[PDB]
Point group: D3
């Protein structure tokens, strides 16, 4: 198959986390299949079908934990597959793909703004919010509360190994919002002064569990200890279909040198392993609500979100498979 | 008034954290008064006395949180005051200061060894152990349990902002102990494979609370959630006497440039604050045992230690005072 | 603009709490629009419509917390709006308002009876039951369980500041049920002899939280500490729709003279504030079941009730609005 | 009135626990109905109808706690009844009974196989599983996981008084799975080495509570204590529809001779009562997931299984009733 | 025996709670025995011995729950008894009693001031303190923090049935301290804004339990839920000797009409009992510290306080017994 | 080397559990030492000394977990050793052994009687008590309470594998106390009707943990869950001095034939391991009080029992050692 440059560049940048955030990763995965359909030089429908099959697979094997990525691919290729199997001609396939792909990106953008408006109603004036990592959705909520004229301060946790909290601190601060930057270790110490916790999701499971950035479960734990509300801002495509039939989510182990730089680690003894999980799993009992673009749920209603939007596809194979 | 440079240098190095760890800071300050005494050029007792008080004030105003420091100073200066007020001559006073400092240092070393001997009995063949920061007393326990031929593995938390875990990791490796190095955030995620938790203490309070490196309380919190024993390895001079009469322990707020380096921090907007507590406080309900040189205690028995060894001095002002 | 006195009197009495309890307030407001419609002197639909909206605004601005009230108003006014905008003539509109109000009142009465029938099955012969405030729906359950020949005894909390428990106590006694009357403070002390807890609800939220009379959350808290079932007896019109899209329920702050009578309160210094929340919020983790007219649910299933019966109206403004 | 031998045998074998396990009981009840219809000497529809009614009551009045039994009888008799009231002739009605029984029996075996497939995905290589009693659904999960190449070990609790664990241990051993057998008392002692708990259910209620063999709640409680996942393997016919309308599940109290043999018990004093509850009730807060043949649910979603598969029948009487 | 007027007046006023507060009750009990020794017209030592024996018994049978009362009597009569048994003449007995009695009252007064100074060190500037009932000792702590220039607000709970909170609110407010008065039911609702809880004791037990005003355990419970420190301000004579040898403290049941006034209650049905426990028992795990006049303890160190100050007397009969 | 028959019998009877219960074991060990001295044919002091050393080792190497045994041997052999090193002649040394054994045996019986007296005060009229295994100290508490006229009922858990509960039930029945006998699995089912839990101890550690019959921790855990008091009835020789210096108590693993009889076990597959821990370890957070003959303590005061009664011996070797 004749895969375009942009499909491979996008895959590289997902692996390397130059492109990161589960929402963004997913939009970018959709963008890539769109560009493959723009520039494809294929003559028949069945050539193009095959390019998009292979482009999808390239994109799926980049980073495993955020289901947002495969839900973007599925959004485009369920539609592309249906077109092809009902004998769409070539230009009818090229459009299905381009259009499905634009549908997903626009609905993503709209969902986040909507999550912002909903979640902000749960923020009270004077609140001190503690967040983790960098999440566009969590930030939509905090940003929207500030624009409503609520006076808020956000406690940004640093989020090692990759320092995501620096992006968050600068982002919120540039909107006018006062920020307090602290280390991940200081989360319990400042939980007493915290009124709310607002964080993202990479995968939400059937039973209510949230996979998000490493350290998320600690903040959640001690939030429960102190009765601070834990609010997970998360789009419906963060919800994980395969968990309905009993799959556990893969937790991405990233390279040791994101923790200890190569120049430093090569000097350390052989009997020190460095372990770099990218994500942990927060149980549902530590979660007050999940703010989706369709509204507030208890985390145990994740099963409904999946029943009604995703369940149907589980009897079929994946839409990029032979 | 005529204070030697070794006192001034010890101070500077305690502040900058070139000299660090509660016990070592204590030994360094004992040592500093020793050198003041050896090298003093005083002719009268009153003149040496005055040097020994001023040197004590300089050493005590360095770092507040770890009570080891003022306890070392008191061990020396109670004995210096008793001698001076009982009419000691110049050389009897100089030797009282010197010999007292030596007793403190010697007892500090013996206590850490004995703590290791005692704590090691609570480590079992096969144990995965999680620790935090760098604690001589904690390491002593792990080192001895290995030396007894137990096959242990230690999970070492990175301990930001100052990366104390690097020190711990390299040291444990160097005695032959396999290490797993993780970010602080990952402590709950790895608590399910952990069997024991073993950390140090900077100050231990009347009611059993352990003030220790920032993040300690999170590790204990989730340790307890999981039923993993939390064991604090701690010398009797870590116990805090002022807290018998209601005093709260000051928590050191250290320079923000330790968190975010100067060169970068000055590029950030005014409306980000960086906050950097060097310690947090862990409740007694989350501690299984404290391991002192005199044996295993439940945390609530902190008060006995304080009664029988320290309470006598609480009717009197500090032995360095005018 | 030409509003009858029955609407004005119903309002005044809802405010003063002469008419009180979530369900009864709802029925009183349905009834108030009914009388507005029966007695209206309008010639045009537009003129009646306008009376029905203004009367609705007057009734809704009385007391905020209990969602029963605006739910009753909507039951009537959704149907009035649909008729008016579909071109109904004066008398078709008047009858739509009147007949809708009647359906609400009739359904309210049937629901409380059925709730009693359902809840009673969860009461067992011999049960000591603790309750709080005065709730029709809660009493219905206790009354029916007695009527079935179960030998129950009810602990009745006094419920300050308004002494709601006196009402509950006299009423339960009058059906033949032995009562034990205690101050609110004594609820933990008597929780060890309690078998069941049965209380009402003013608003139930998207995530399962029950807003109810002040003190409810304490009784549930210690009920849970003790493993005593907490059962909330509540009509579907107690469920709060705005909370699907992030709205927090306002908690009524009532006059301080209800706490400390006027004559006494004016003798007190300026620097005492009296604060008087009429409700508190009980988390879903402390609730065993909610008992509605449609059956037993776990609290987290609040969201289903809200979805299938109320969410449809959340794209539209209130049916009383200009 | 003309009930075949086979029905009376099934009933006796169910009461004496010669046939046992919730699913197998249900399959035996349907088998009996199937054999009543096959061998019936009834001449008219109304005569067969009456034999089946009576068979169904004989069967329902054997053992109360496991609802799998009445759900089997309902499955058949709902269909048999809908035929009879439509005016179905004799051989038409005999086939509704015969075929509905076979549908139930086949779907049962299919459901359990699929529970195995789904629940096995939650077992990870290396896992140690604690189980309780003898559940065919739980065993399917453990068997499948092992067949996938996962090296697991199973802690089989003995399950007094009927010694069920001996059956589970022998069985699992017979597939090549290493079993650790321990007494019920030791569940907490070994919870620290358990990774996963997997058990059956006799009845699952509307709020998520699980009724299973006596002991089950203790194992769930200490599992929650230690953060081990509790996974309930349960066919959808284990869910209890009467609970939707407030019913409490009856806890079968069986003979004291199953605890203390007749020989020994008769010598004991009169003032020793021997109580033998066959089941207990685990709350949903201690259950991570229910594995059904339609998927994984959080325990709070039990109410949906019921709304959507059994809720329709609650306005009618039992099908075997007049 | 010729008991003076003031012994009987004091007993009456303890029963009626005209004199109340455990410290005050005890000082007043001591005052009474003092006055009996002032005014006694007795000729021999053995007459006087007998008057004080009988005066003590009159005072002991007034209110049972606060051990402060009998510890005051014991303080005077251990001394009086020792005098008499070593053959003190009459004036030597009259003084022992008068003087012992003044010793107790002065040490009481001094202990409270000292509890104020200790406990205030645990109060931080800006703190919002929630209290219960009226306790001189709790107030000493809060009063002393305010005089130190810490800016504090106190949340006074009303404390039914007897309204103690009115005395507290007026008292604190008259010292300049801002007060918030709320009902006992509002304790959890305002626990989120509370930094510290400071309360009294009537009896502290060997194992750490605090008997204090009804409702105390609820505030403590929800304080633990929210991680607010519960500090019990309490003199060493609040500690309960008989608990060392396994006695449970009697919980005083006061007359129903303190709850519902006589004019009102006489009209209520016969099947309503009104239950008025004066006190409840807070377990030690909900208590952070006990501030005694000898300093801060964990509640589990109550056994030490009793071992060293009280243990010795338990092998002897009570000092007012024949 | 010349060890009498009686010592070898005691040892065998201890290993096979023909003599059992921690106290009774200890009394049997001292009895053996007493009989070794009485019947000794030794001519010199050093010869008797040597028989006693060897007897003590034979006895100590029977069963490890219950420390009552080594504390008995220590009581005697500390005294026997202090005599021998003072130069005591033969008949002087024989009497130290004989008399020290009798001192221990008499004080044991006295301690248990006094535990009964003390612990009975915590039983209230009406109480239902759950117990576990067969403890003479626990039984003393239940017997005394009943003898005081309190109408109690006792839930006797069966205590597999050795069926201890049958002994407890028969015994208690024999004093006229109504017993409910239940299997271990049912402890949580009946915890809701239990008012009080009362059990023994084999070893009590320095931090308060209680080692008792397998199952004990499950009963403590579900008791804590339901706020039932857990009361441990334990002689002061149950406290474990090695634990002061970090030692962990060994958990005796006994024969698999005590779980599954030899006849049956030999037929089973090789791939079923049967594990029989005889004890488990209850944490101090789940224990309300330890009832000793010197009084009630909170479990955290165990360290004082030890400091003040056994702490002296830890700098020396065992008395029976060379
Ligand atoms: N890898 C995973 N995939 C899906 N769900 C998980 C995974 N790990 C944990 N969970 C769920 O998330 C929660 C975390 O529980 P625990 O592991 O006990 O903290 C539980 O509900 C688990 O069932
Ligand atoms: N600065 C401090 N000095 C002494 N004790 C403290 C300090 N801060 C907290 N504590 C104690 O440590 C524990 C921490 O409580 P929490 O507020 O639950 O983290 C409590 O037991 C307090 O008594
Ligand atoms: N005003 C409110 N409106 C709606 N939900 C609320 C409100 N206040 C609290 N909650 C919810 O109710 C529960 C109370 O939480 P806590 O703050 O633990 O008492 C949480 O589940 C919140 O989601
Ligand atoms: O989709 P949004 O809300 O922006 O963020 C969702 C989550 O995905 C991210 O992972 P990574 O940085 O890609 O590894 C972060 O963990 C974040 O909370
Ligand atoms: O001794 P002080 O600290 O003043 O108060 C101690 C306690 O005694 C009181 O009881 P009551 O009003 O006599 O029934 C209150 O409960 C108060 O907390
Ligand atoms: K907070
Ligand atoms: K673990
Ligand atoms: K109860
Ligand atoms: K585990
Ligand atoms: K707070
Ligand atoms: K109970």
């Amino acid at each position: 198959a004749m895969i375009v440059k942009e499909v491979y560049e996008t895959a590289e940048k997902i692996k390397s986390m130059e492109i990161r955030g589960a929402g963004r990763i997913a939009r970018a995965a959709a963008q890539a299949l769109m560009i493959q359909a723009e520039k494809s030089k294929a003559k028949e429908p069945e050539e193009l079908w095959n390019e998009l099959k292979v482009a999808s697979k390239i994109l799926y094997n980049t980073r495993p934990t955020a289901v947002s990525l495969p839900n973007a691919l599925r959004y485009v290729m369920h539609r592309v597959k249906a077109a092809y199997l009902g004998g769409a001609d070539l230009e009818t396939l090229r459009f299905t793909a381009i259009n499905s792909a634009k549908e997903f990106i626009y609905n993503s953008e709209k969902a986040i703004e909507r999550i912002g408006e909903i979640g902000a109603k749960r923020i009270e004036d004077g609140d001190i919010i503690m967040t983790h990592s960098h999440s566009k959705a969590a930030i939509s909520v905090m940003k929207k509360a500030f624009e409503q004229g609520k006076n808020i301060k956000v406690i940004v946790t640093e989020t090692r190994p990759k320092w995501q909290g620096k992006i968050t601190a600068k982002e919120l601060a540039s909107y006018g919002i006062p920020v307090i930057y602290i280390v991940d270790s200081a989360a319990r110490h400042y939980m007493k002064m915290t009124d709310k916790v607002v964080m993202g999701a990479d995968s939400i499971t059937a039973n209510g569990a949230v996979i998000n950035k490493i350290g998320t479960s600690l903040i959640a734990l001690t939030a429960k200890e102190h009765r601070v509300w834990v609010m997970i801002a998360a789009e419906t495509y963060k919800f994980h279909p395969a968990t309905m039939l009993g799959q556990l989510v893969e937790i991405e182990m990233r390279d040791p040198t994101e923790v200890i730089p190569e120049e430093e680690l090569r000097t350390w003894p052989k009997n020190i392993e460095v372990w770099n999980p990218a994500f942990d799993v927060t149980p549902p009992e530590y979660i007050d609500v999940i703010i989706t673009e369709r509204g507030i749920i208890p985390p145990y209603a994740a099963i409904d979100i999946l029943k009604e939007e995703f369940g149907w596809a589980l009897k079929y194979k994946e839409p990029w498979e032979d």
